[PDB]
Design a binder for this molecule. Sequence first.
Ligand SMILES: CNc1cc(OC)c(C(=O)N[C@@H]2CCN(Cc3ccccc3)[C@@H]2C)cc1Cl
Ligand SMILES: CCCCCCCC/C=C/CCCCCCCC(=O)O
Ligand SMILES: CCCCCCCC/C=C/CCCCCCCC(=O)O
Ligand SMILES: CCCCCCCC/C=C/CCCCCCCC(=O)O
Ligand SMILES: CCCCCCCC/C=C/CCCCCCCC(=O)O
Ligand code: NA
Length: 379
Amino acid sequence: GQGAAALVGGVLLIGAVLAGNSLVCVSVATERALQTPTNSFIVSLAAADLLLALLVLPLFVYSEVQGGAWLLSPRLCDALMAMDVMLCTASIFNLCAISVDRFVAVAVPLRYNRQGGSRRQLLLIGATWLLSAAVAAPVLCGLNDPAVCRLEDRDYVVYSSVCSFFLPCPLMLLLYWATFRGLQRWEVARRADLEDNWETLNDNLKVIEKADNAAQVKDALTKMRAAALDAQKATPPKLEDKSPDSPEMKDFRHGFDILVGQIDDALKLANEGKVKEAQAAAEQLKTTRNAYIQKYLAKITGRERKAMRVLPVVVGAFLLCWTPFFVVHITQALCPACSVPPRLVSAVTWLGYVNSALNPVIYTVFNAEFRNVFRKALR
Ligand SMILES: CNc1cc(OC)c(C(=O)N[C@@H]2CCN(Cc3ccccc3)[C@@H]2C)cc1Cl
Ligand SMILES: CCCCCCCC/C=C/CCCCCCCC(=O)O
Ligand SMILES: CCCCCCCC/C=C/CCCCCCCC(=O)O
Ligand SMILES: CCCCCCCC/C=C/CCCCCCCC(=O)O
Ligand SMILES: CCCCCCCC/C=C/CCCCCCCC(=O)O
Ligand code: NA
């Protein structure tokens, strides 16, 4: 009765965690549009969820069929609980790492000399996992004084409730808040104008790629030049009060000067009838914007802020799913006499674990790139 619901519910939960989260990892692996700094953390979150389904949920379900009785070794129980605590902590610490990472990307504009990221996200992810293991490590040493698998050490439970949850949460919330406000300060008033300029650039690079002749190339380059110059005049509020002589204003203007200079050289070539050379100059121009310009066009048009919309939904769902769990557990640990109904302890646990099945759904619905890869699984 109570056992059959756990079994069916558990097999369905485990199936849904493995299915959804493997499809996330494979998608980041197969689709170039998904290989971003942010999605490195999303893969880390997927790993945490896959590991939960592999290492924790099966014996959790088995436990639930036995009505919470634990018939196996007490050392195995300790091993399970330490893994339980670590994976929970790792999910939270990774949501925290995202907000730290995104705040820094926003607050600290950097341009590298060489190809690729710094892999600082990977280092931060490594740090996140080692920190989660550090929080969980004492559980492995055996904290209990029976036939059930529970954390009975009240000081440990309060400690981890605070470190793993009640402390990261407000800080994470403050950081997401600062991050979103930071980006907004970069978004120009005349968004649609700058989007037009941006489309002119991309549409005409494609016209150039397939041109029949030099005049088409020259016409396309001429439009690009005008759009580059317009875009150059779209100043973000972030730099509005910055003087014309400011080294941050001198930066801004410069990226567009390099661009206009490249367009001019391609123009000279097209004008002389050198189609292939003009097309190569323009392709070489698809790489100068690939880093210097386009990164911060997505920023100043509001695209970047829009693409971050999936993150609060993920954070939100995590808070909905785990807040009841941590309120129940810290209460019990602080106040033995504050009796929580066992059926509710069971409920908030399942609620916590079902979070692990939710993120793949959240990405599919609320993020455009993920939604896109998904919707072309119609093959
Ligand atoms: C990150 N902080 C914590 C996380 C916990 O579990 C996710 C718990 C917790 O009490 N977990 C219990 C301990 C075992 N776990 C369920 C389970 C897992 C595997 C086999 C049997 C029972 C329960 C949900 C406590 C803390 Cl402080
Ligand atoms: C935005 C702050 C966080 C909000 C709470 C997060 C909970 C996420 C849970 C997932 C279920 C969402 C179901 C909503 C479906 C409608 C979405 C839509 O209309 O585009
Ligand atoms: C418990 C319900 C959900 C609580 C969490 C809500 C979402 C967590 C993130 C909050 C940081 C605020 C970021 C702004 C979100 C909207 C984006 C925007 O309007 O620019
Ligand atoms: C992210 C959402 C944050 C929500 C914070 C509120 C949750 C914390 C409340 C739980 C404390 C329960 C108090 C238990 C009584 C302790 C009294 C005693 O120690 O004797
Ligand atoms: C490639 C996308 C991410 C990896 C796959 C995720 C696996 C779980 C997705 C299935 C959820 C289906 C329910 C809602 C479908 C939303 C599709 C849509 O909005 O058009
Ligand atoms: Na998780």
